[PDB]
From a paper:
STARD13 Arg974/STARD14 Arg449144 is highly conserved and is likely a key residue binding negatively charged lipids such as phosphatidylcholine and fatty acids. Based on our structural analysis we propose charged lipids as ligands for STARD13 and fatty acids as ligands for STARD14. They are down- (STARD13) or up-regulated (STARD5) in cancers, mutations in them result in metabolic disorders (STARD1) or they are linked to obesity (STARD14;).
Steroidogenic acute regulatory (StAR) protein related lipid transfer (START) domains are small globular modules that form a cavity where lipids and lipid hormones bind. Here we present crystal structures of four human START domains, those of STARD1, STARD5, STARD13 and STARD14/ACOT11.
Author numbering: 908 to 1104
The structure:
């Protein structure tokens, strides 16, 4: 047959050259984008944004201690160990939509509220703990996860989540674009949970 799609070849060629953020279409007023790390790992690094009607340190507490207020799937949670005033081992479970197993998490988080220019950050990465035993389905691997919250406007914040998770056992042809949408919706829910509703 005759149909040259060297086009789809030429895009895949220019993306390989590029090492920064590739933007996406995103619903419900969010900014999505991705990035190939050049890792030797197919998994993309994603970056979602929103403007949220609350000052940074509030938004930070909303992500850090109040996620039952914005995630209907967020089920079992416990601080597993406290390492210092601002770092800990946290363990939660997320329930899954279809008859799948649950995605499970055990993470080192540290957070920071006294950064220059009113900035706050929460950062996470998966670990194992001698006391955090499979609370259900499938251990994920938070390879990267970082919330950057910065002041924009009068008592409002720009919330940005850059992450890269390896849930263990779905298609690479699913984390190609579908995962990004899940990120943009997490960050939209956080926003919604500060709207009189």
């Amino acid at each position: 047959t005759y149909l040259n799609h060297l086009i789809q070849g030429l895009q895949k060629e220019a993306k390989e050259k590029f090492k920064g953020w590739v933007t996406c279409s995103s619903t419900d007023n969010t900014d999505l984008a991705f990035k190939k790390v050049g890792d030797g790992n197919p998994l993309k690094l994603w970056k979602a944004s929103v403007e949220v009607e609350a000052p940074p340190s509030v938004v930070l507490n909303r992500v850090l201690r109040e996620r039952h207020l914005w995630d209907e799937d967020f089920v079992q949670w416990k601080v597993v160990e406290t390492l210092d005033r601002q770092t800990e081992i946290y363990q939660y479970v997320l329930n899954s939509m279809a008859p799948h197993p649950s995605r499970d998490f055990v993470v080192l988080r540290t957070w920071k509220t006294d950064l220059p220019k009113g900035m706050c950050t929460l950062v996470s990465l998966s670990v194992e703990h001698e006391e955090a035993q499979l609370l259900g389905g499938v251990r994920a691997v938070v390879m990267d996860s970082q919330y950057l919250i910065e002041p924009c406007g009068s008592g409002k914040s720009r919330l940005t989540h850059i992450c890269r998770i390896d849930l263990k056992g779905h298609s690479p042809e699913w984390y190609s674009k579908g995962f990004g949408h899940l990120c943009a919706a997490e960050v939209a829910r956080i926003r919604n949970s500060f709207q009189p509703l």
